[PDB]
Amino acid sequence: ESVASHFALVTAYEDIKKRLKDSEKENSLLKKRIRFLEEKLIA
């Protein structure tokens, strides 16, 4: 009946959802960088 296991999984879920948000932010920046490079190289 202990909720320790649930607490442990919340701790993990909280961090993975933060890593997901950061990974998506970085992917958005990588797409911007690609677009800049393609404008420079492909006219």
């Binding site: 202990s2 320790a4 607490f7 442990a8 999984l9 993990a12």
Partner: protein
């Protein structure tokens, strides 16, 4: 939920090199009394009971249990015992009564 945060895991990494030893750093909170057969387990995220540990180490105790400044300790997991798959794992501190007193953010052996 301060009862499951009486031990805090410090500086946990997102990735530990496969095949290497892993040092686990933890801090006892002010009033928490560690016992000799407390342990730190490595658990796959999503575990239901403490018996699912992948491996474990008995707690490293400070020799001065009343010193509030000696509360930071570490335990070393040898590579031989560690996972080498891509699953998510966490550290959990389990006391002698089987209560999880702390849980870390997850990491992979990658």
């Amino acid at each position: 939920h301060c009862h499951f945060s009486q031990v805090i895991f410090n500086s946990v990494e997102k990735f530990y090199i496969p095949g290497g030893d892993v040092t686990c750093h933890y801090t006892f909170t002010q009033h928490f009394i560690p016992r000799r057969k407390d342990w730190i387990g490595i658990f796959r995220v999503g575990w239901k009971t403490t018996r699912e540990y992948y491996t474990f180490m008995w707690v490293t105790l400070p020799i001065d249990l009343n010193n509030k400044s000696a509360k930071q300790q570490e335990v070393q997991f040898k590579a031989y015992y560690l996972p080498k798959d891509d699953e998510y794992y966490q550290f959990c501190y389990v006391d002698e009564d089987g209560v999880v007193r702390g849980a870390s953010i997850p990491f992979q052996f990658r």
